[PDB]
Design a protein around this ligand. Structure first.
Ligand SMILES: *C[C@](*)(O)[C@H](Cc1ccc(O)cc1)NC(=O)[C@H](CC(C)C)NC(=O)OCc1ccccc1
Ligand SMILES: *C[C@](*)(O)[C@H](Cc1ccc(O)cc1)NC(=O)[C@H](CC(C)C)NC(=O)OCc1ccccc1
Ligand SMILES: *C[C@](*)(O)[C@H](Cc1ccc(O)cc1)NC(=O)[C@H](CC(C)C)NC(=O)OCc1ccccc1
Ligand SMILES: *C[C@](*)(O)[C@H](Cc1ccc(O)cc1)NC(=O)[C@H](CC(C)C)NC(=O)OCc1ccccc1
Ligand SMILES: *C[C@](*)(O)[C@H](Cc1ccc(O)cc1)NC(=O)[C@H](CC(C)C)NC(=O)OCc1ccccc1
Ligand SMILES: *C[C@](*)(O)[C@H](Cc1ccc(O)cc1)NC(=O)[C@H](CC(C)C)NC(=O)OCc1ccccc1
Ligand SMILES: *C[C@](*)(O)[C@H](Cc1ccc(O)cc1)NC(=O)[C@H](CC(C)C)NC(=O)OCc1ccccc1
Ligand SMILES: *C[C@](*)(O)[C@H](Cc1ccc(O)cc1)NC(=O)[C@H](CC(C)C)NC(=O)OCc1ccccc1
Ligand SMILES: *C[C@](*)(O)[C@H](Cc1ccc(O)cc1)NC(=O)[C@H](CC(C)C)NC(=O)OCc1ccccc1
Lengths: 183, 183, 192, 186, 183, 185, 188, 183, 186
């Protein structure tokens, strides 16, 4: 039940260089966002891309596919949180082009450390636990980079779930400003 | 089946600036409505959009994606309740352009406070409880803003489910008037 | 099948299951998850032994991964309420509700076996419902968390802030570490 | 159904308990371990001087449940002589080797298997670290005790348990896991 | 459920040194048979024990607990096959004291190699395959000893399921004679 | 569920002093073992005196049934069989396996006979092995049915290719039982 | 849980104890194992005293024909008269075993209800096997009708016609039909 | 679900000689990648193809249909890891044309030996075990070839899961360089 | 589901069909076999003189569904060239070797496996014997046709298929199952 304009409603919006990231982040939905990004860049390598984010979080490697695409392509990707951007969603929100990251007024942001799960031999448990610790550190480094917070601050603040209103997300350095009304 | 007109029935009405919000509010259906609003705003920034609402409620952050787009876009969003607008549905109904919020004569309205659920360590239970109580407070502030009721009245009236007929909804400030017959 | 035992009784021999037999040694086992019914059985055994002789010690062996707090507290309050000292002995593990009842034994009379392990942590819970009810239930679990820290602090001799700090996440303790922490008084190695 | 004996009535297992024989059969877990522990304590109360015979046929099980048995075998006064029939794998091999020195037996066609701990956790990275560190400590303690009972160096036990290792009964003797093969009743 | 003087039909027959092995061979039912053997040996080490076998097969290690107890205890264990002895059942049947192994006239025997199944890394697969092949060889050697067949013949005859009538089982050396009428 | 009489005995235990044994329901290893044990018990108590096996069964597993069949022949006492309700397939086979002159239907029982049913899954080499075996079994059971009924081998096989139902008088005419019990003498 | 009872000493459960007054209960769906328990109690009570009547209380929704016939033939074969008493209901196999009692000794409790009907069955298979199995259930149907006619005193034609669909009878109607002899009301 | 440029987003990028391998490697998804490669070769046999890889691994034989196609066709296949390339994903990454294998900066690579499982008669277990061992050695030989590491180093390093950062994957020889920003 | 579009429009498979290329992927069953048969019949109609390329990546499948493809391959006028990528096992290996003589290929890292039929039946002994006779007839016919295409004797095919038999691509050339290894496009 998706409406049409020959373009479906999202194809139409893709014409105004708008991409939607909605729901849990996972490989296949992430692949769709990456293809839209490479396409938009192909269409006009200089003009901004708008990425709307309404997401409860998701899988780290899937989110890192979108993150590296965002940094790799020529156009600035301007991120706009609507609804919520939690964990992986907060991370991609803050990864937008400096000065071009926005929360809508009543959107809410949440941040936290990695969660994972493994089963098997103690030797293998060691290998996998070291990996998720490595991953937690890189994520914190990147989050510190984009927010302007120190690495130590990000580590403390993400030990447990932390929720932030749109003004709190601005103050934290997570986004640059609230978008309220179309200028 | 969705009938054809070359549009499907909904695409055809989208041409009249008409959008339908039907069913449980959740991220993807919510994103469809946001895309339709953004599409219509692009087609004509000054012409009103009509949002028909028939909903038993739904997810708060999903609903707030719709709310913020309603307030962000240039066109006024006129809201029309058919069937029911309950909880998140009622919130988005009252969020329409002042003077352009309608109930159909036998539609019914229901308002209530958030419901949620979390499992985990006491420390985490406290973090999540804080967040749902904060959201409850903010949603009340916005309900008061739109209906014209005092914050305190709203709090009182939402502790448990409260049902309103179309005439009672007009009286409460939830809607501006009743549409009985077209002109 | 629980093995049984036959024993002279001056009114004839009668049969005792293995656990009934050990009750005559004044021994009670707490094994597995703590939950109302298994907890009630232990309460009942404690009350029985006190009636048999209010002045002789009881031995409570604990091998438990944890369990329900109110069920645990039915055992805790009974251990304090009855006249005899309840000596506690950890075998296998005593985790969470199990560590709590272990440390709750009569002072000087709480023991770990040498290769037992102890784990402590804060409460875990979960509610669903209206925000007003969520607050009510969150407030209750936070009340319980504090009361349980106060009692752990009491029994171990650590400060409340130390117990609070140490139980935010799961913490494991070897037998020597549990002695060093104040959780038990000593290690039992070879039958005294 | 458990056979009864008429004399005044024992099930087969209770009858053999009176001859100081306990059976550890199947996966090791808290409740069946509690039953073995209880039987050991009973036998000690009956006579702290006479040996106990613990027959072991087990594919392994839960480490803490196994350690309740291990520590009881060491704590009680009587020697616990262990006899492997069918198999003793992982926690079953550990309990077999933990028997009184000189009094650990394999039956001729029994087999033994040793390996390191297996586990699984789900949660925050912080919690994953806490749990991994604890499984690694357990792995080390279990290796130290295996070395002690077998006569192998800690290094050799660690190397030989990275992956499953099977031993015939003569191999379990050569390894120091048991003292001798029991073939026929003397 | 069993005929009762707690004291069932099986316990009365135990009084006459008769033990039944019925159904799939598995640790717990095997421990019961072991316990009955040791009991009977303690009662009288000189008198024969009678083991009726009606079994489709089962777990090798469970079976070996019985086998080794049969060899270890002082009394001779006489085996009698009723209905069938397949695989682990045929193995325990032939393991009875030579001269005291019997088929009833219309019982059937079946012999085969081990079946197994593992999942894991190729290194682990290699370890578990090596072990099942070791077990296959040891079991073939013991079958050869008990039947009087060569190792080569047992190997060739067990690569696939091989069925034997009671007279065929006498000819193969798996039992000593047919039991038809009590004298 | 099981009533008892009083030293205490359950109802079936009680009837066991009457030298009466019940075979009820699907024939399978464990219920068949209980019947075997009762037969062996009764022989030991008195090897001269007849045993009465009441049979009401829809059939069952062949090997389980053959444990009973061979025990019936092996023990010293005659086993007299009495069909109540029905004796179908393995039930009919054990009915006709009773001592000659001592096999009975009650007037409204019915007997049904049929060939073996089975099923295998595997490589074609294994399918052939198993199919050979079920056919060997089918033949051996027809040879035993012929022995007990007095019909020829080829005839029993013909009449059992499909399910065949018999009234009590028809079961007598076929040679499956000797007589019909109507009113206790 | 079945209540215990101590007879001045052995413990009988409620049912064991009422067996000493020669009372057996048939309750629920008639099936092989429950029906064997009834057969064994009948054989027990005959062995105790072959002259003395047995009382069989029936409260049953119906059940398997062959299992019912195990009980029917035992009722007829044993020396004692089996008196039947319906409480609650006796439907189909229950109604048949109720009317199978000793003539003059078959009763309904007043608010008993009886129902009668023809066999129901089902099969799946090749057409050849379908015909075999259809012919067998048609034979069983006829034989059950012949027996019902014998016990009720109704003609075989009446029985056949009345059992083509479920037919319900009050206890008064069951007396009038010949299904039971009389209504039992108070203890005399 | 798939944005409609007439063309879907993937068909559109196919025009740019871009193919996505996303998720578990399995016969049908692999056949789709094969078909795209064959098509791009038929379109221009001398121009590179770009294969974006975000995969947790998969079935070996499916992976090898891709591998052999990559080698067989006339164009070079440049591989680009986004998110992760694990096991079969890492193998296909490393099998890209020399000089043309890339990791995005926060992509992660993991290598390990085969996993398999089988159930059946010991004779059959022996056959299937021999086959997985053959496959393991063959895969090591090919990894050694593509990375420049010795066969013994590869064997040692893949007995258990080995994780590599993007710079570590460059050091290891799995890829040639890190891509960061579009030239 | 996702199949890329090429340009009036074509799906990726449709485009490759223009090159006379057909894919047989996964388990052989009636409906996927029917699609392959239809594609062959179409390509014959387009040009009865030009070769057809069948790529095979399959773990095996249903014999009668396989024979619908096999007989199509022999019936049609064009030579059908077969190319194994990934694996061709059992029914896959059979269709691979059924290709036109000299035009059967393995890619270098593909693997082949061959085995006798597997089946299963439940019913009366009379019926078991009918169905057992049928699967044995099928087994012999499939061995005859494998011997024909490989050039091996029928007794060789019978012996070698009694259990799963795996072959590397060079082994599959030595066996006569394919004619050569395709490595780089000419
Ligand atoms: C919860 C949130 O969505 C995080 C993403 C995240 C963003 C930013 C920072 O700094 C850390 C994390 N998502 C996850 O933790 C997912 C959780 C769900 C249940 C899929 N976890 C995940 O992808 O596992 C990562 C992992 C890495 C290495 C080893 C094992 C697991
Ligand atoms: C029930 C109605 O749909 C409400 C939305 C609402 C509107 C206006 C006001 O004042 C309050 C609430 N919906 C919910 O409460 C949903 C019910 C779920 C979908 C069953 N709850 C929800 O979105 O949870 C929000 C939340 C959870 C945890 C922490 C913070 C917020
Ligand atoms: C995990 C351990 O067993 C704890 C017991 C405990 C001991 C000592 C201290 O200081 C704190 C806790 N058990 C629990 O937390 C249980 C785990 C459940 C059974 C999964 N949780 C529990 O009993 O909930 C209590 C509760 C819930 C809601 C509101 C109030 C109390
Ligand atoms: C597999 C075998 O039974 C081992 C026991 C063992 C014996 C001897 C040595 O040296 C090491 C281990 N059992 C386990 O590993 C169990 C297997 C489960 C039941 C599948 N694992 C277990 O008890 O988990 C241990 C654990 C310890 C600390 C933290 C988490 C889990
Ligand atoms: C089919 C038969 O019951 C065999 C027992 C047997 C007897 C005599 C000889 O020579 C060989 C075998 N039982 C098994 O093969 C069991 C079948 C299971 C219960 C389905 N298999 C078994 O116990 O596997 C043991 C094993 C697996 C992997 C590695 C080593 C041992
Ligand atoms: C249907 C009836 O109960 C038969 C028993 C029978 C009695 C007399 C004659 O002459 C033949 C058969 N029972 C079976 O056929 C069972 C039915 C099963 C329980 C569904 N079948 C059976 O035991 O198969 C045994 C078998 C299978 C494969 C190979 C050999 C034997
Ligand atoms: C419904 C009532 O209980 C009848 C018993 C009955 C009594 C008196 C007369 O005259 C006819 C029937 N019970 C049945 O019909 C059972 C029904 C249930 C579902 C078991 N049916 C039954 O036993 O199968 C009948 C049958 C006979 C021969 C062949 C196949 C099936
Ligand atoms: C874990 C990773 O995805 C491997 C692929 C691999 C790549 C490179 C090297 O050097 C080794 C392996 N995938 C597998 O192991 C799959 C895992 C399954 C899908 C869970 N295993 C597989 O395809 O089966 C292996 C096998 C080969 C031959 C015979 C039987 C089984
Ligand atoms: C395992 C392989 O895929 C074989 C195909 C085969 C090819 C070549 C030769 O010489 C023999 C076999 N496939 C089968 O055996 C299928 C496997 C099923 C789908 C699991 N079996 C099959 O089609 O059964 C055929 C059959 C059954 C009963 C009677 C006649 C034929």
């Amino acid at each position: 039940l998706v409406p049409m304009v020959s373009f479906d409603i999202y194809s139409r919006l893709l014409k105004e260089r708008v991409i939607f990231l909605t729901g849990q982040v996972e490989d296949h939905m992430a692949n769709l966002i990456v293809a839209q990004m490479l396409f938009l860049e192909a269409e006009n390598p200089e003009k901004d891309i708008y990425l709307y984010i309404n997401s409860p979080g998701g899988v780290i490697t899937a989110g890192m596919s979108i993150y590296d695409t965002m940094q790799f392509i020529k156009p600035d990707v301007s991120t706009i949180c609507m609804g919520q951007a939690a964990s992986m969603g907060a991370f991609l929100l803050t990864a937008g082009a400096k000065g071009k990251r926005f929360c809508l007024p009543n959107s809410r942001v949440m941040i936290h450390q990695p969660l994972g799960g493994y089963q098997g031999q103690a030797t293998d448990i060691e290998i996998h636990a070291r990996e998720i610790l490595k991953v937690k550190g890189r994520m914190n480094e990147l989050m510190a980079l984009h927010t302007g917070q120190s690495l130590e601050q990000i580590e403390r603040d993400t030990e447990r779930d932390r929720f932030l209103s749109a003004p709190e997300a601005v103050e934290y350095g997570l986004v640059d400003s609230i978008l309220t009304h179309r200028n």
